[PDB]
Design a protein around this ligand. Sequence first.
Ligand SMILES: [Ca+2]
Ligand SMILES: [Ca+2]
Ligand SMILES: [Ca+2]
Ligand SMILES: [Ca+2]
Lengths: 122, 126
Amino acid sequence: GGMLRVFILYAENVHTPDTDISDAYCSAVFAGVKKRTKVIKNSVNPVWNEGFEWDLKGISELHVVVKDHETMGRNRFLGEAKVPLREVLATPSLSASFNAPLLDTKKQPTGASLVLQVSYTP
Amino acid sequence: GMLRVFILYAENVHTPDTDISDAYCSAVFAGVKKRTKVIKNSVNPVWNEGFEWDLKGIPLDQGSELHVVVKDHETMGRNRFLGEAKVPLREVLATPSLSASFNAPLLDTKKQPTGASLVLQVSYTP
Ligand SMILES: [Ca+2]
Ligand SMILES: [Ca+2]
Ligand SMILES: [Ca+2]
Ligand SMILES: [Ca+2]
């Protein structure tokens, strides 16, 4: 009964904490429901082009976390951003484009950016 | 025999972000894990902590290293690995006094130098 369609397009300047080349994926959570992209192996500028659909069960910010896949182990945090969906309700098309600067554990910009398009079907 | 490793300090240990390292140092020998206290907000943490392993006749597999790992303590998420180094105790302890000082260069997740180093003292009492 209603839908949130989030297309995660790409990221730029995604750098890990060492000599490893970013194995980046995004974990996005809307209304407590989490969706995660595939891992782009060995890229500092990952292109996912992955579309997602949050079934709005008849009912605001989108929280996206970018992590580095760790070759058999616990993935490491690279950066995160919160995007307000109010601006999505703003334009008549019920959709908007976002260029999100990734923030660190201390909420400071890491220098990486995530580009995603949101859309609402009431 | 008693294996006593004194962890003095680390130098140039940095987190991946604006966080100033809240470093602690784990040390593992023969499946026995030891861990220092956490030094808040220092890229050159000093622990000055001593640990002991009673060998007590546990398999002395020919080559058996001390595995040291330095991590950054986190309050909102998982602790972050900063650097790890493998100390060859047989080679370092090969002195008349059965004691030595070792500067272990810390390695990253891909086995490449991080530029950080851990200073320690090792000794074994027959
Ligand atoms: Ca990689
Ligand atoms: Ca990785
Ligand atoms: Ca800190
Ligand atoms: Ca920390």
